[PDB]
Enzyme design. Structure first.
Site, mmCIF file in Angstrom:
data_model
loop_
_atom_site.group_PDB
_atom_site.id
_atom_site.type_symbol
_atom_site.label_atom_id
_atom_site.label_comp_id
_atom_site.label_asym_id
_atom_site.label_seq_id
_atom_site.Cartn_x
_atom_site.Cartn_y
_atom_site.Cartn_z
ATOM 1 N N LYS A 156 -61.244 -23.507 43.446
ATOM 2 C CA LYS A 156 -62.549 -24.141 43.609
ATOM 3 C C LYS A 156 -62.512 -25.284 44.630
ATOM 4 O O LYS A 156 -63.565 -25.725 45.077
ATOM 5 C CB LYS A 156 -63.111 -24.603 42.253
ATOM 6 C CG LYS A 156 -63.786 -23.499 41.442
ATOM 7 C CD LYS A 156 -64.605 -23.944 40.236
ATOM 8 C CE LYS A 156 -65.415 -22.791 39.641
ATOM 9 N NZ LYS A 156 -64.565 -21.965 38.782
ATOM 10 N N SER A 216 -66.595 -31.151 33.806
ATOM 11 C CA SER A 216 -65.268 -31.697 33.582
ATOM 12 C C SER A 216 -64.238 -30.584 33.758
ATOM 13 O O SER A 216 -63.050 -30.819 33.535
ATOM 14 C CB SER A 216 -65.158 -32.375 32.222
ATOM 15 O OG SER A 216 -65.421 -31.460 31.162
ATOM 16 N N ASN A 232 -71.447 -22.361 42.144
ATOM 17 C CA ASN A 232 -71.328 -20.985 42.603
ATOM 18 C C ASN A 232 -72.500 -20.491 43.459
ATOM 19 O O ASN A 232 -72.342 -19.458 44.104
ATOM 20 C CB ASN A 232 -71.037 -20.051 41.424
ATOM 21 C CG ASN A 232 -72.010 -20.273 40.287
ATOM 22 O OD1 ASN A 232 -73.194 -19.938 40.416
ATOM 23 N ND2 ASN A 232 -71.536 -20.860 39.191
#
Ligand SMILES: [Ca+2]
Ligand SMILES: [Ca+2]
Ligand SMILES: [Mg+2]
Ligand code: NA
Ligand code: NA
Ligand code: NA
Lengths: 322, 323
Positions: B54, B82, B152
């Site tokens: 990511k 988180s 996303n």
């Protein structure tokens, strides 16, 4: 001069290369920052059988003879049931010959199942060394086998040395190798190799302070094995160094760093968490060494350091909290 | 066709991020080859900075997106997550020397507060409601002249994730297929754009838990069918449904979708830990489970060289027992 030469390490590499993995060297920014060095991790945990011991085991199966009158080993035999027994059984299977592990009646059920699971036959003995030696010798004689010691057998040492051939190729600017030590088969093969090829490169041993025979031996200048079986989370380095590996370690190993149980535990966890590599705690020994206080004594010129992550054979169920 | 991104965006992303991310290795497994009958290649994004892929999309976003202020550079990043996204965004912020803020309900566990601060996000508190979460995030974003980055659907994120495929195609010249776990489909879409631009003969296959099979259903029906309720799955990183930005790409450019049971995921994850010694998180087990599954067995033998994205390694060690 020693029980192996660089020539033997090279024969070993030729002997075993078709059947082992040339394991990768990985890096970690995080560990670089923590240690102040440029670290490289030779990932023997990804080797066949889950440890580097396949190197020595396969070399032994491919180069030892059972007898003056028979060139081909017809079986392999050992008293060691952990990474060596697993590696030796795999080597035996590759060569199409049976493997026997000599096991005291008093071994845990888990141990007995484990051996069976890796495809060796168990031969039971009494807990006594007189019994073990008798049984292992009987088995070796009856089966026309070779007995393959986990760390003192020259063909084993030569095999383990192949790690250093790869490292020197994978890390041309390496300044030092850091190697966990038990019986010193890996340490000694690597020391022979490095000092034959590029003696400016340092060879450092890492050892649990709870099992510190290699440190004590180098300190005293003679072979001083553990008086008593050691207590350590680093289960793969509970052997003492021995008569074949000691002279090499005395002469060709630059320094020995010892590490506490807590240091081993913390380094192992760090590798799991920050590198995502399932090392066994024994393989955390070298990482602990490089993190330890005494390693700060190593000259700042020794910048590029390759640590051998020697194995990945961990039972995860009981390992997290240990 | 034309979508929220093109390959040109992936090329830009690569130049934007390559100096700061790991070109992760591709590893292999003799046992897994034998269990599947294929030549598998494992793209090891579990070794990526922050422990997941990511950072690619997050860094691309932090280096591309602009705040609603005078100066064109974000002065902060603000997050809700988180998880892998939040951790990636936090790191991207550190690289850029700007604070990361995470909005946290008053009543989140003291454990998870410690964990949040461990990766260096600054905790801004809100009341535990979707209204208060949203509105605190907006306030902090605005007051700090910061940016927010969707996990996303953000085009900069999707383009960044595509960089995975750029590397894979270089690292495995003869690759025949990529297998990619899908949640929101940022990674799957970025990969599809890249693969189909560069080497369209290479198959792009998605893998998803049968317990969260919105991608499978969507492709079957030919329309976007999000999960009716928040799914229960061990694959905690793929709980999101595909969205309006990733759906068209996935509809047109993804070859097939494989679903896997919880048991298949747990088993594939354990297999990777035990046999490959790679600490993948269960979400990354999804793609392995896919190639092991019965349905995958039926895939044509010409599709020999298969690259599975091991998407992350951020797993709670203590909780590893019993998954
Ligand atoms: Ca020792
Ligand atoms: Ca889904
Ligand atoms: Mg130098
Ligand atoms: Na003999
Ligand atoms: Na060589
Ligand atoms: Na000797």
């Amino acid at each position: 001069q020693y029980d192996i030469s660089f020539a033997d390490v090279e024969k070993a590499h030729i002997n075993i290369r078709d059947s082992i993995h040339l394991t990768p060297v990985l890096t970690s920014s995080i560990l670089n920052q923590l240690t102040g060095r440029n670290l490289f991790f030779k990932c023997e945990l990804f080797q066949k059988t889950g440890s580097f011991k396949i190197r020595g085991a396969l070399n032994a199966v491919r180069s030892l003879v059972p007898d003056a009158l028979e060139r081909k080993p017809k079986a392999v035999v050992t008293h060691s049931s952990g990474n060596h027994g697993q590696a030796l059984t795999y080597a035996a299977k590759l060569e199409g010959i049976p493997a026997y592990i000599v096991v005291p009646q008093t071994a845990p059920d888990c141990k007995k199942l484990a051996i069976q699971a890796y495809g060796a036959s168990i031969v039971y003995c009494e807990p006594s060394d007189e019994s073990r030696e008798n049984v292992a010798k009987r088995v070796t004689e009856e089966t026309e086998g070779i007995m393959v010691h986990p760390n003192q057998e020259p063909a084993v040492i030569a095999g383990q040395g192949t790690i250093a051939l790869e490292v020197l190729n994978q890390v041309p600017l390496v300044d030092a190798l850091v190697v966990p030590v038990g019986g010193g088969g890996m340490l000694a093969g690597i020391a022979i190799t490095v000092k034959a090829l590029k003696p400016s490169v340092k060879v450092y041993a890492a050892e649990p302070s709870n099992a510190d025979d290699c440190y004590q031996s180098k300190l005293k200048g003679k072979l001083m094995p553990n008086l008593y079986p050691p207590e350590t989370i680093a289960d793969g380095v509970k052997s003492s160094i021995g008569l074949n590996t000691w002279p090499i370690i005395r002469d060709l190993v630059d320094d020995i760093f010892t590490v506490t149980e807590d240091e081993i535990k913390c380094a192992t966890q760090l590798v799991w968490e920050r590198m995502k590599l399932l090392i066994e705690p024994t393989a955390g020994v070298g990482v602990a060494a490089v993190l330890s206080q005494h390693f700060q004594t190593v000259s700042p010129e020794v910048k590029n350091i390759c640590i051998v992550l020697s194995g990945g054979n961990v039972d995860l169920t009981s390992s997290i909290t240990w």
